[PDB]
Amino acid sequence: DYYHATKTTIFNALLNTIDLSQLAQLDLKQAGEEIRDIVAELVAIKNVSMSVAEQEHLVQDIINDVLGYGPLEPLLARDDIADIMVNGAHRVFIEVGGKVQLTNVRFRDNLQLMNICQRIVSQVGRRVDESSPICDARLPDGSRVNVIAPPLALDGPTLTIRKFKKDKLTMKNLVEFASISPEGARVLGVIGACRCNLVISGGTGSGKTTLLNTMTAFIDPTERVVTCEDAAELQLQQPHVVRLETRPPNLEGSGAVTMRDLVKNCLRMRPERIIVGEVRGPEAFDLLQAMNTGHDGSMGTLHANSPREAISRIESMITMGGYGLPSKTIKEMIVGSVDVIIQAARLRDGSRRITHITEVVGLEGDVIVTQDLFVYEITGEDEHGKVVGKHRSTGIARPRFWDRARYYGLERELAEALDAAE
Amino acid sequence: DYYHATKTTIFNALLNTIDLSQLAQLDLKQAGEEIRDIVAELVAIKNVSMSVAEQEHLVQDIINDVLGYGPLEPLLARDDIADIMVNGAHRVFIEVGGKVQLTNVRFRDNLQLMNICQRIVSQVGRRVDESSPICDARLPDGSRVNVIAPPLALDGPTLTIRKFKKDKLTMKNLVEFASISPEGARVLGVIGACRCNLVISGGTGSGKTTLLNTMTAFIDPTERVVTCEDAAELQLQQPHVVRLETRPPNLEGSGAVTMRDLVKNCLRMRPERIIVGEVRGPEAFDLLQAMNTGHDGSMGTLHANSPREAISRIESMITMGGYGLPSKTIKEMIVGSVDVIIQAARLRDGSRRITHITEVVGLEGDVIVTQDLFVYEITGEDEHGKVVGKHRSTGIARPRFWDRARYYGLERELAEALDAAE
Amino acid sequence: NLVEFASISPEGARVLGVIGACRCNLVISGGTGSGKTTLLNTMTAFIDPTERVVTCEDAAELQLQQPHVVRLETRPPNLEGSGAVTMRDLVKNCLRMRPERIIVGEVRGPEAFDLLQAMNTGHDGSMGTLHANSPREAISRIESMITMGGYGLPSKTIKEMIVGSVDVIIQAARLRDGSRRITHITEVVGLEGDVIVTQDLFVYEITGEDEHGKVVGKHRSTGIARPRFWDRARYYGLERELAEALDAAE
Ligand SMILES: Nc1ncnc2c1ncn2[C@@H]1O[C@H](COP(=O)(O)OP(=O)(O)OP(=O)(O)O)[C@@H](O)[C@H]1O
Ligand SMILES: Nc1ncnc2c1ncn2[C@@H]1O[C@H](COP(=O)(O)OP(=O)(O)O)[C@@H](O)[C@H]1O
Ligand SMILES: Nc1ncnc2c1ncn2[C@@H]1O[C@H](COP(=O)(O)OP(=O)(O)O)[C@@H](O)[C@H]1O
Ligand SMILES: [Mg+2]
Ligand SMILES: [Mg+2]
Ligand SMILES: [Mg+2]
């Protein structure tokens, strides 16, 4: 259509007609209004039979390309979308109703896509380029974006976006999805109420954050919880909750406040619980402190595929913190601090389930001893292809945290659930 | 030679007529359009007897030396040659028909060759010199260039070009070469379509990558595929494929993006199948994770002579990377993740055979149990062939992956091929 | 010349030729001055001329006869501690030059690991020189070097890798009277636990000294009918020579 040619011609000229440094210092509406005059002037020269609505659409497209996120803006806005995949300048896919399908949109050039990705990542403050070719981030709106640079992606820089979900799941939803048997839900309720230190371990996309949210839903409302995340993904209904959020290095690369700083400050604002949005770095150390140095009941979420692996990664993180503690000391601290290690994993069929509810019970010489209260045994593959399994207790009638249950009167509930779940 | 002598005489005058640095000052991508006239106009400026037929060849050679890649040009241009290899200004070998062969072509001097290689690599943007004698790059043409500088290669500058084979063997070709019997071909087809996890073991140059490509040929077009190759070798026809390639560490030991660093990201961009060009280290772990963390149907390739060798080697690779997982856990992960292992070997006769198609069923005593389905049996040795060509199905009705085959509706072909294998 | 100096019996020479042609991952071992470099050069003289061989030598010593050899030499940290192209980097690059055999001049440290990978990952027929007094001591040194590489490799993993990659070890020693002899031709046979089991196809046995003080000894075979690498010989049709040599040794 003549509209596309007119837009291309106007763009090829307005670049040298409007100074970028002037619009760069204005909000989206201000920049669009300023560029409206430039678009009108361009239309005046070599004018075409374009309607006012066509001019407005062209101005919106110019704003999206120069300042927005290019041909994605029409799609990103749409709510029907679940995921957006690009994997090349000339191809873009969308997930609708659980089915991926091609789209009619595309970028002018893979360099346009590259700079669009750079803009999107910069919105979080990270950098993607030939020296830093891979960038994963979670946007403030909550959607996740992963981009990879040409030096690795032979087909040009590749981009993927997964849009933030409006509604979170609750323990009832997990029970109905069979991610955890109802007795497992009861035991989780006991563990959450009884202020047992929690490390929800899992793998990528394995539902860790959802478990953390559902568990924190069990906290006594009176307690002063201090959420601490890299992004605003936790929603707590408790009345007294303080939500923090780290800030990464920006521009020159200063003003950053890492998770460790936030936790170390949390220690000095008398929080009943600390709920770390995710543990990746030395903060684990400062988190493990205040799991036992008061603030009992703090929770964290961690990326590991097995409770043994989770403990190993905690030890590795603490060691990398530079505190130079002996490995024996680190193991002792872990044993003394961590009480429960829930593990959420995704199975072959794609469903997500809580494979282990492990409980750290002691340190034997060199190895931490872990006794599992709930374990998920996979029977096999159903007729329909969906993996099928059953949760079962280990028969423990008095887990380590039993004492804490006695503190809150939940001893009977725990005893009932433990034996009834087998 | 008369032609070479005349060309050298003409070039001696041309270099003065058009300064050597003059072309560099001009746009090298289009400066040749000028020098071509200089040689064309008043051809034989030295008044050297020649003919138009030979004059055209002389002018083309002069242009190639001045602008092109000199004597290397036909080699690159010709399609018959897969690999070019230069050990110095004197000796240059090519690869054709699967065999190496010396060639009559040679360069005038080491400085000429060094300039040629510097130009060829710089076209990608990298630089090779005494400061950085080593150099590795991938050209836009789909080729890999490795260059070593004289300060290291005592014989002189060393160069190796590995071109991307345009035509990969189709499955019909493999059937024709008796590599796999038609029943084996159908079993492979069902396995590929049935979204079974593959590990294509093979011997040195036993055709692993070609087998992997012909296997990918079976993927449903709608499924997202994220190809992660050490070196671009695969060629997929699916509409929705994504190609990734690692980067070796710079000579300073920086900028490296190892395989695991790629597959870990592959986990995060919603793939349907992850395909690893060659699993050769701790990256295997991550792949196996993605093998069972959903994404079922991923296919990686490994170097080994027997399926048992391949699986033991995979355990070894997993235990690297400092992950420190128990061997029992590694075996459990492997049995739960991998489904089918295919072993292909190059026989003494010079041909290649898909020697094994086997299935993993479990440990049954901490020793992974491999149940072969298709075996290549050598009834004996031909006096001059030493090859028989017998592919036999072990029977074994209802292989472990039978249920998935039924789910996808390929049960008919699986039964028809596994049975009536001969 | 080596046969003339009785350093190896003709049967030993034939077995060595079999190993060289049969693409067995060799590791020449021997004390300093044992001529191990000379032995390595002679062994390379047996490689098939078509095969492409890349020579990564810390200092130029080898002189191959084949027509398709690429010679490489390391660099010291000339640039004030920088610019050091260590042997390990050279081998890592050689892995990307599609060579048939990688002939390391001498293995002194981390470069061993990658070399082993070369043997395990396609480049069969690779060779190398190691400074050692006994084949077992040589294997221990190789494991130690791999560990020194800094890779977080459990000792069991390194032992298994050595088992699966190496195929032959040749021991060359300078004897008391200043002569050179080849003492052992062993073949790593597997990891049967926490220790690497080893076979010995060819051995040298001393008996005493002559009237002039010269040590007296002779070579013999262990009678192993089929060495581990026997299958490789089948690949290149070297069964007959291997059997004949291992049988005629005694
Ligand atoms: N048990 C479950 N059943 C069904 N859907 C689930 C279940 N658990 C999680 N989900 C869905 O899967 C996604 C879970 O993502 P979640 O935020 O938990 O990931 P994460 O572990 O925080 O991720 P990452 O490790 O990549 O940062 C959401 O879409 C959630 O709706
Ligand atoms: N089954 C086969 N029969 C005949 N030739 C084959 C077969 N498989 C591979 N080849 C040839 O061997 C060459 C190497 O194959 P490829 O798999 O790319 O390397 P590698 O064997 O090292 O993985 C290819 O160019 C191909 O033509
Ligand atoms: N079998 C042998 N008999 C006699 N002299 C030998 C023998 N092997 C090596 N030499 C002599 O030893 C010298 C150095 O040996 P060399 O290969 O440098 O050992 P290394 O590599 O351990 O230093 C050579 O110059 C050679 O003349
Ligand atoms: Mg999360
Ligand atoms: Mg290959
Ligand atoms: Mg020496």
Numbering used by the authors:
A (entry chain D), B (entry chain C): 80 to 501
C (entry chain B): 252 to 501
How do the authors describe this structure?
Saturating all nucleotide binding sites with excess ATP yielded another expanded structure at a global resolution of 3.3 Å. All particles contributed to the single reconstruction, and the nucleotide composition was identical to the expanded structure from the under-saturated dataset. The expanded hexamers in the two different datasets superimpose with an RMSD of 1.5 Å. Since CpaF assumes three main conformations in a nucleotide-dependent manner, we believe the closed, compact, and expanded states captured in the apo, under-saturating, and saturating datasets, respectively, best represent the catalytic cycle. In summary, the coupling of ATP binding and hydrolysis expands the hexamer and rotates the C2 axis clockwise by 60°.
CpaF oligomerization is mediated by interactions between the NTD of one chain and the CAD of an adjacent chain. From these data, we propose that CpaF uses a clockwise, rotary mechanism of catalysis to assemble a right-handed, helical Tad pilus, a process broadly applicable to other single motor systems.
